[PDB]
Design a protein around this ligand. Sequence first.
Ligand SMILES: CC(=O)N1CCC(Nc2cc(C(=O)NC[C@H](O)CN3CCc4ccccc4C3)ncn2)CC1
Ligand SMILES: CC(=O)N1CCC(Nc2cc(C(=O)NC[C@H](O)CN3CCc4ccccc4C3)ncn2)CC1
Ligand SMILES: CSC[C@H]1O[C@@H](n2cnc3c(N)ncnc32)[C@H](O)[C@@H]1O
Ligand SMILES: CSC[C@H]1O[C@@H](n2cnc3c(N)ncnc32)[C@H](O)[C@@H]1O
Lengths: 303, 304, 322, 322
Amino acid sequence: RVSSGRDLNCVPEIADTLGAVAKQGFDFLCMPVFHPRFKREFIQEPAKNRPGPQTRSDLLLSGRDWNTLIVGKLSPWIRPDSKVEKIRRNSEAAMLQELNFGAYLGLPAFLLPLNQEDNTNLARVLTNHIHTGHHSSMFWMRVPLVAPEDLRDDIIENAPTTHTEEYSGEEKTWMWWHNFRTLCDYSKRIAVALEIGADLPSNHVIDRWLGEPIKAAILPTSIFLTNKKGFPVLSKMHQRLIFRLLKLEVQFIITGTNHHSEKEFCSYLQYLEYLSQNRPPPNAYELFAKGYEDYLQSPLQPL
Amino acid sequence: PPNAPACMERQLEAARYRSDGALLLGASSLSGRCWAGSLWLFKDPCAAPNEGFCSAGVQTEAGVADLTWVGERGILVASDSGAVELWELDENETLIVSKFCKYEHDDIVSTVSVLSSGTQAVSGSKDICIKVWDLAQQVVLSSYRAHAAQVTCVAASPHKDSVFLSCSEDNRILLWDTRCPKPASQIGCSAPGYLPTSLAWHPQQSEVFVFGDENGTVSLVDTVLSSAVHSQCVTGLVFSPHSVPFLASLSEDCSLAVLDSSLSELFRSQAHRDFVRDATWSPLNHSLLTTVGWDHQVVHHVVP
Amino acid sequence: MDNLESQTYEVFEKDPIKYSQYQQAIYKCLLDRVPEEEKDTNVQVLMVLGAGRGPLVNASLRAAKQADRRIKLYAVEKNPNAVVTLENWQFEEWGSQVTVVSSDMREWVAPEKADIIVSELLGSFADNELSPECLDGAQHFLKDDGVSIPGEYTSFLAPISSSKLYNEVRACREKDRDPEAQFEMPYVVRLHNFHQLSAPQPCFTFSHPNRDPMIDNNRYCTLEFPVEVNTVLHGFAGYFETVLYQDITLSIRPETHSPGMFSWFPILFPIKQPITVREGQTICVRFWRCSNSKKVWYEWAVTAPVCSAIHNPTGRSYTIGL
Amino acid sequence: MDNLESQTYEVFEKDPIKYSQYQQAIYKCLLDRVPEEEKDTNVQVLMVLGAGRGPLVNASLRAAKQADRRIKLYAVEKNPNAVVTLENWQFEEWGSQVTVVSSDMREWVAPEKADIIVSELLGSFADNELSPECLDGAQHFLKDDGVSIPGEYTSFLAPISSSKLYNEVRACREKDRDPEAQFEMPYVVRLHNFHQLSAPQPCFTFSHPNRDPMIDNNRYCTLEFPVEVNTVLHGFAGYFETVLYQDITLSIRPETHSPGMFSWFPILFPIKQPITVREGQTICVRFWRCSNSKKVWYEWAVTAPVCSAIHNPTGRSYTIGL
Ligand SMILES: CC(=O)N1CCC(Nc2cc(C(=O)NC[C@H](O)CN3CCc4ccccc4C3)ncn2)CC1
Ligand SMILES: CC(=O)N1CCC(Nc2cc(C(=O)NC[C@H](O)CN3CCc4ccccc4C3)ncn2)CC1
Ligand SMILES: CSC[C@H]1O[C@@H](n2cnc3c(N)ncnc32)[C@H](O)[C@@H]1O
Ligand SMILES: CSC[C@H]1O[C@@H](n2cnc3c(N)ncnc32)[C@H](O)[C@@H]1O
């Protein structure tokens, strides 16, 4: 059994789409609470007085659905560490607005991305929102296993890709997260949603992550290989990383469009269920200790 | 008109004139219970945006980030769904039907441009992919991942099928030649500046183009010369159909400007009340310029 | 200072007796404000000050149809997450009748003055969510003959002995703060294992609109509660009563409690230290409502049969933000 | 939010170089504002915003006599205990020339607009006593061509290593509060046993009068300090520089320090946790000036060579009251 979620940036009708993904086999949905292209100005007129409503209505779903089925998503134009002052200011206002709306709705988690190196002003705004108002909403930082730049295709003739192995340059994304987390003073409310790319990085990178608070793991459809029949599958090193994560017990999330148009979409999910059932079986220590994981007891003083 | 929807969505994203004089507008619903899109054809432009006084209307499944004319009946659409869809005009030019809707991108499709051939197109997305499409075959010939951030704009050269521009939130401007085994080649400043956002080819010099950045500055380059035109991001740039063309610039400061060739401003309009999204020049009256914004306005300007 | 979550609104919106009491107050006010011969010439300006998700707006529509009069509605709300609900309602249902305003009432410049201002800014102790301050900053856009609904509210207090609740306030001690701070703050609590020692008596009262030349929402009230048993005082229960319009009233006072109205639980002002009380003695409690330019708070002390210590001096433990 | 005692005023009034710098700024401004042929027809409106016990009033009188021009004086003060001094001075000495006002400048409705507004609202880190907010609320009664003295001010920062001062901030731990709160607040301190690691660089700058259409006193500044020794960072020193008028300046920056001016000591933004720094690395510090409708505060963090934690998020440890 595996807790599973679907990611989208396009949801025209919330009722319809939520039903369709739930019928696929998914436990929850990651959507934007605002339209990701609906850019909003807070300072300059005339755009700041744009007439409402700014987003869809909370009544389209029950308190229970917002609490157990939806996961917020910060709009992608919200960039608080922009080099442009006006942009940083609007993005701070927009972040607070989207995160406070998620708190209003009661969302169990809320997604935010670590896609560049400097996320300092982003961290601060989050820290402030954490400390302002009484809530327990969680925050899933979307950080990639290999950075976009370190994954691009070597097709730029006059700016090639560094083919020299860099030990600490391949650990770039971890430091994005270590910095963000250190700036927020290790909040229990801040967790990592680890994005998994097409080509996995050297084993050391993978090893320096499972000490961290992973609550979700993100798999795009583009990494799935096709097998003999026509179903989506995964290489053996990717499968090994999966086995690790299910041991560390996380919520998997599928993103991207259907690339295997011969079979429906629940096939990716079924592949996940497959591996879950077909995992190395639990021994007597693993069966018995289960439930005590990372639980701190004062030590026994039998004198 | 039959099949038309009763209401067109408040946020007008794109507006493009056809050679005869028809206005194609594409609108997206960015707020409210339903987040969809719509395509409309107005053989009379001064009638826009009345749903009752249109020549043809239809509604797509999702918002319309960008579109462009494919000939005189085809319409290329960049859907939030992650799909590039081609809708074609009826024989009588009263209806609009989806010819193909291909879901190849893993995130909002934000740019489409048609190559000089008219049988091939190129799309940019927020998934960091650029795809080259065969409109005939309805499949993707090539899928390039050259950028390190969301692809903001792609603009196909007006005369070479192999050559097109792209710019991304990774501070990169690329020039592409599908004939090279490393198609893309990086243009730009010696030092990191502000993110590029809009690309416009020049209609008469095949190696010259203009780009506008997120800070509101427009620049002219040859494979220097720049002016701070807007206070905010430059969302688009469009050249006039004149013998010596005028440059139209659009911004998120709800203003439009028209520049010459030394990028000296000549026209200035603030009639729009929300982001001024797209601008298209009249093929009949060359001193006439139509603009659409998120304030549901279709505004026509008399340019000197 | 804080904005309510969506489910909070949802639970307190599901209380029928409250909103129908409000409907009827509006109905009676509409009738007494325009006669049968003006029922089509005269449009009443209605301003919901603190509108939420629109239950008072709907009850205003229902009351205007009960009373066959014309109204012009304004829905003023400060919480923008709730405004998203209001503006979607105004699009697909209310239409142009309702004009939605996303502003603080004290800060909003209004197009026209109002005939009636409806408010639901009341707490378990009447004024503890600061209904006074807000409506005083909003009465400047009220017609010189205008009606506030509600028109007045009174808070009530009664001494109680509960060893259970005393222990629970005691357990509410938190690190990084005063170890006695927990007794210097009121609590909304559904009192159950407790002993009311004397019948509630009125404490602070406020009237709207307040046409005094100098408005002062500060207060000082001294109450004497005769007890006819031995007992040990642990706090004071707080209740309230409010006049919506004329004989239409809402109350959580146990004597005159509105039936089936779960919207307000009582409040509890504890005392640090239990005060033993004999048969026949009197309990004297003093209560102050203090404010500055930024916050508002309650101070309170027991003076008979023995003095307590002035609780929450200077709002040092508890303050209500403006 | 607090009013200064009498001896505080007295000590900082005994600094000659400051008040004579102010005298000369006034003198140069008076000359450049009325020519020799208007020296008897034209009376300049002068408003001392934050007047104290009257040292700026006297230096205004002295400057008007140096420059042989006519002035009309207003002494605006908020602290009423200091107003008692001002009003006794105005009775027995200044006479009708000075008009004493006991009000907050942001709140005072003025009879006429001013030619010049003099202010001494500056702290060890320039804006930390909130000169900006006050003068922005007082510039509405400034002539459209008016001059503020001072006209601009800039704050400065420099990383320091001091094991002594780190231990002293550590010892400043107080019960009933966050055990790390003491590192999340600045201190006015006369730095002595310390090691400045890199030359001061400018942080936040403010200009008066600020003719921007939307005034935003919030700030975000990122500074990079190259260090050429191994060392262990314990905080950042704060200094300031201000342009009174033209070339007349005051500064406590050690490079351009005004001589014999003891009025301002430097400020110190500590960091919770010492950060070890190698030869050749760079220290990156970020600083934010944040405000709401009620208070103003500084947040700060170190990002290079290793991240620190955002200090004083939300003003949770330190805030400056409006
Ligand atoms: C449904 C239902 O059967 N039950 C709801 C929960 C319970 N009752 C309460 C009451 C209070 C209490 O009194 N709180 C003080 C508030 O100021 C009250 N007002 C009411 C008006 C209002 C309107 C909208 C949003 C908030 C408020 C707050 N707290 C928590 N549980 C009874 C069972
Ligand atoms: C006489 C004298 O030889 N010494 C006075 C004491 C000592 N110096 C200081 C300085 C400060 C320090 O810098 N504080 C920050 C204040 O904002 C400064 N400003 C100055 C302007 C002013 C005017 C009137 C009243 C207050 C202020 C505060 N603290 C305490 N001791 C030097 C020796
Ligand atoms: C429905 S319970 C109280 C409601 O009134 C709103 N409200 C409270 N105070 C104000 C105010 N000063 N201005 C506007 N709305 C207010 C609250 O945010 C909430 O929606
Ligand atoms: C002389 S040091 C600062 C002086 O300015 C006064 N002051 C500070 N802020 C204000 C204000 N907003 N309005 C009036 N006086 C002020 C202080 O109370 C003190 O006298």
